[PDB]
Amino acid sequence: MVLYFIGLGLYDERDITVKGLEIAKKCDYVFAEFYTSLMAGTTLGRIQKLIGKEIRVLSREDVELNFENIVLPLAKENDVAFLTPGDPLVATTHAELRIRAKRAGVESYVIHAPSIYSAVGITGMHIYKFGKSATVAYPEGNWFPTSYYDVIKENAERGLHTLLFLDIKAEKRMYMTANEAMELLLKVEDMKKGGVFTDDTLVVVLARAGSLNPTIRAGYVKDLIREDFGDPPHILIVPGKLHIVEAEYLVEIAGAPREILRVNV
C-alpha cells in the first residue's frame, strides 16, 4: 500500500537508522540503487543479510525512465522500499520520484540517514558557513564542465566555505578522487585565471566519511594534489574565511600546516 524512500547511510550497512532497518524488514519488496554514491564499507550481500530480504538493484535508466513501471506498480498492492546510499534526497534527483508516486496514487514516506552534506562537520568547518554547493564533473569528449569553479569564487567572495561533491560513473566503476578534482580545478584556473584555485589554495579532503577511520586532511593544493587519501568516495572542500577554532581543528585533527593558524582577519 505504501512506498518507502530509505537512506542506507555513509559507509556501511550499519549506517541505516534503526527506524529504516525495522521498516525495511517488514516491506514486501525491496528495491535499491547504488549509482548516486559509493558505500565503500559494505556489499549488497551484507545489506540483504541485515534486512533479511533479497534486494533488486536498479540502474540509472531503470529509475529515471522506468521507476513508475518497475517500482510503483507493486506499491499499489504491497509495501515497497527503495534504498539509496546516504540520504535519498540529498544531491540526487530522487525527490522528483515522489511526484511520480503521487501522480500514480501511491503514498510515499522518507526515512533519512547520515548524509555527506552534514558529515562535513567532522572537518571542523562550521556547517552554517557553507555556501552554495557544487559538483566537479568529468569532462567528456570536447565538453569540459566549469560551473563549479564559479561557485567557489562566489562563496569565497562572501567568506563562505564550498562543498564539492565529486563525480561518479558507477557503471564504469569510476569514482573521482580529490586528487583528480584538484587537477581539473587547476586546469580551469589556467583558463579563467580568476585566482580562485591555485597551488597555494587551502583545501580539505574528507574520504570515506562514516567509516571509523575516515581520511581527513587539510593543506595547500601544491602539497595535497599528489597525496594518497585512500579509497573513494572522496569529497573536496575549499574553505573561505576561517574562524580561529576552524583553523585550530584542521591543524590538530587534519594535520594542516601549523601556519594556517594565523588567519588574516
Next chain:
Amino acid sequence: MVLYFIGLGLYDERDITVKGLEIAKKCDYVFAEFYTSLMAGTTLGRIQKLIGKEIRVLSREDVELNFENIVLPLAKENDVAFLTPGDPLVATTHAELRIRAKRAGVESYVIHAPSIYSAVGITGMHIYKFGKSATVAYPEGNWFPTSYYDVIKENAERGLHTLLFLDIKAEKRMYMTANEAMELLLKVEDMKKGGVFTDDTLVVVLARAGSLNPTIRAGYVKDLIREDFGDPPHILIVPGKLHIVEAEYLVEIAGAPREILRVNV
C-alpha cells in the same frame, strides 16, 4: 581509552543508526546533552530503554566548561559515548571537543546520524542551492539582532535558499514557532525596508522532520503567518528562485499554491 561522538537522529529514539546503537550498548559510560536541541518525538526514558544504559545528561556548562573533567577522565580507562541530537559536530562548538580529547590523550571516533541540514531535502529544495545558514533569535531588552535577515538577502540575491533555525530555550523547553519567526522577519523588514521578507514572500515550513508524518507546508507569508503547523520544533526556509521541478514538488507535496509555478520560477 575511547570516546564515541554518537548522533541521536532527528525525531525519536529510532533515529539513531544501527552502528550508533550497537556501539553505545558496548560503552561503559554514556553521556548526552539536550541543550543544542531536543528530540521532541521521544523521551530520555525511551532513549535510555533502547540503549540499555543509564544516560547521564550534561548541561551546556558541563560540556562547554567542564568536558575535560566530566567526560574525558572516564574515557581514559573505559569506552565512553557522548550522544547529541542530530549529527555529531554540526553544533558549531562541538568540533572543538575533539581537540580537547586529543589533548587528553583520548582517541575519539564519530558515528553520524541524520541532521536537519540534510533532512530538509524532504522539502524538495535542491541541496546544492542552499547558501549560508542562520538562526532567528528573539529581540531582548535593548538588543534587536537582525543578521539572519541579511543572510536571507545575500543568499536570495544569488538565487540561493536560506535555512533558518528558530530560537530555542532547551532547558525551559520553549520553542520559537515558524509563525513568530515570520512576525519577527516582517518587523525586521519594516526597519530595513530592503525588500527581503514581506507578505508576498514565499516560504516553506518543516516540522517534525524525521517522523513518518512530518508537516511540510509552502506558501506566501500572508497565508501561512497564522497557520497551525503543529508542535515544535519548526524550521523555516526562505527559498530563492525556485526550479520548475522544485516548484512542482512544493505544489504536489507541500500543498503550495499553483501561483508559485509562475511567480517564483
